[PDB]
Symmetry: D2
Subunit: 217 residues, 4 copies
């Protein structure tokens, strides 16, 4: 049994291959699950320095930290202690594709994250391989039940040098390891920021605010 506390930690291990380059990342974070706020500090422990834009990894580093109104079932918080998995397809407008798969567990007051990240077909002259990205725009994700699990659809946008953007469609499927009450269609408004980085992004800190809601009308 689990009663998620108003303060919880995170621990993350990510294995990635992007444009054939292997890397590993170790994360340690903290947040306020009921407030929809969290931060994480990350270290590239294998494959540094990364030859691609670190920004593509930010949204792969924590679904228990969404502020859910009492009226919308909280699929993520209800899954504990057994937890859940998620899988994501990232379709960039220049033909690049990432696939992501993730397991979320709970050890004491620490959520434990195990991530696989695979990125292919990044154009060598593109914003990702040329490291010309400048963080994600805020987003609104549609969350809805399907096939006894939960899906999330969000059109994402990376800021790029020159002041334009670079679009990526996220399709995510979230799977509880135990029976939980499914919500109805709703939305999550997100904002993810890289708060600090060293020169080659081997050391990064990032934060997210995420709040669930119904349509305003």
């Amino acid at each position: 049994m689990s009663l998620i506390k108003d303060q919880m930690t995170t621990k993350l291990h990510l294995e990635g291959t992007v444009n054939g380059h292997y890397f590993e990342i170790e994360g340690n974070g903290q947040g306020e699950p009921y407030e929809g706020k969290q931060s994480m500090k990350l270290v590239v422990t294998k494959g540094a320095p990364l030859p691609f834009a670190y920004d593509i990894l930010l949204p792969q580093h924590s679904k228990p930290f969404i502020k859910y109104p009492a009226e919308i079932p909280d699929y993520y918080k209800q899954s504990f202690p057994e937890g859940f998995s998620w899988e994501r397809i990232m379709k960039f407008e220049d033909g690049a594709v990432c696939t992501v798969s993730q397991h979320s567990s709970l050890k004491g007051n620490c959520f434990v994250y195990d991530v696989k990240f695979h990125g292919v077909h990044f154009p060598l002259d593109g914003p990702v391989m040329q490291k010309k990205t400048l963080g994600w725009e805020p987003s609104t994700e549609r969350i809805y039940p399907r096939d006894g699990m939960l899906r999330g659809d969000v059109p994402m946008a990376l800021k790029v040098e020159g002041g334009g953007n670079y679009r990526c469609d996220f399709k995510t499927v979230y799977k509880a390891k135990k029976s939980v009450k499914l919500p109805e269609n709703h939305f999550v408004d997100h904002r993810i920021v890289m708060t600090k980085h060293d020169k080659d992004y081997t050391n990064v800190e990032q934060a997210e605010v995420a709040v669930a809601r119904n349509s305003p009308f």
Copy 2:
């Protein structure tokens, strides 16, 4: 020169072909452009009764009726009197595709809409050809400048009999016929409802509320 009034009318002509079936629709509507509210009454004048779910047409029937905060440039309202065009790709999760193209002009206090609608690859046993849809869910559309024009990305969801949904990605490009001040990235929260229909949807009434905003945080 144009000063859009707090009450304006709409007039629409749509030509469509879906799964090889030709049809035409005539619309007459009204709304409050600065309040983000409008309604329209439609008549299928050629190709009735429609052999497919009328719901796929609802979002092709009016961008001047978005409530824009003073702080976000209103691309649509600024385009008048010359107006704008839009083009949309609708990618359904069962492989069906619609393409839409539209011209918007202004005659007196009446916006005039001229629509081309093309739908292909609807599965014969699918919710659209089997008329098992039950209206659109609310949505949040990302609006952002690109290539001197405006784009909108929104993951849409049709309710279907049995209580599931049926997803459609909209990609829209909006093109002013004259120079206008482009906004920055923002969002439009939408809700579109079919308020009334006769038995075979030859006579439909529909309404939309649409409000532009920045991220809440």
Copy 3:
């Protein structure tokens, strides 16, 4: 009843809208249905001069003219006299989409073609709107039965100025108006050429060779 002759004519009417520009094309052609060879002469009768690359239209101008080995059922030839319809999605690598829908009938020794063509999201600086295309490469289309009808999948490539290419995925569905014997999986090797054009492509002649086959091993 129909016995397709070793020489047959074609007559075509196409209505199109590309990047919001309306046009109509009238075609008259001829070929050798059992030899897989045909030609057609086309006139842009409305919307001339076309503001986009004519090449995108070539493959929308004739499935009875495929050389079918006796061992593979000929879905197209068997459909006559009632004929068939087809619908196509064209996904270009720069995000442009065309939808195509078509009816094929037979009047005497003349196949009669009625086409709807809709093209959206062509980038204004792209090879199509900048008329920098230099014809299609040859192709191999996979033909296979599904849902009591016939599908064709072919990765197409347009030659572009500078000597590169520009890819387009075709997904086609072919629907006989009467019961016919479905083939098994097979291939059609194609080559389509624009044999002549005037300066603004208002007058075009084109030819196709198409031969059905099994895998060579």
Copy 4:
């Protein structure tokens, strides 16, 4: 320096995650590079028994074994001894996506393959998770130069129980580690067969024939 011999061996290591399930495969094979023929024997060494259709892995297990006519440059054979990498996107018609990335080297007369495979969004009731596949159909892949590298586009089809198929678009990019002469547009006709398997596919043998060609006309 390398002179590829008329008989060569293969050795392969693959790491995979499909629907969150980790596995590893070890391969040993042999073929006739100039004849376009090869075979491989595989062992699932971690993650056995696989909970998904083994068929999705067959085309990730060898580009030096294509019969190239003298008139078409052989990008793969020319890359040795330094070799090449490839990256693939597999888009299934039911929304599942695999990403694949690969390094090919040469040690003595043995090609050495190092593969990463990531599969997400396989529907739990789909042919892959329900192990209802019955091998790949033959295919024709378009091979063409882009961005100083080589691309391959092929619409693939998996046979499924009941006698239908299940389509997957492959987009592959091939990157030589050294300067080589690029070919022009051409085709590769393929046939891949699983020649033997034990009950849970922990032990598999497979073979491929692949021949490059120009258009027949």
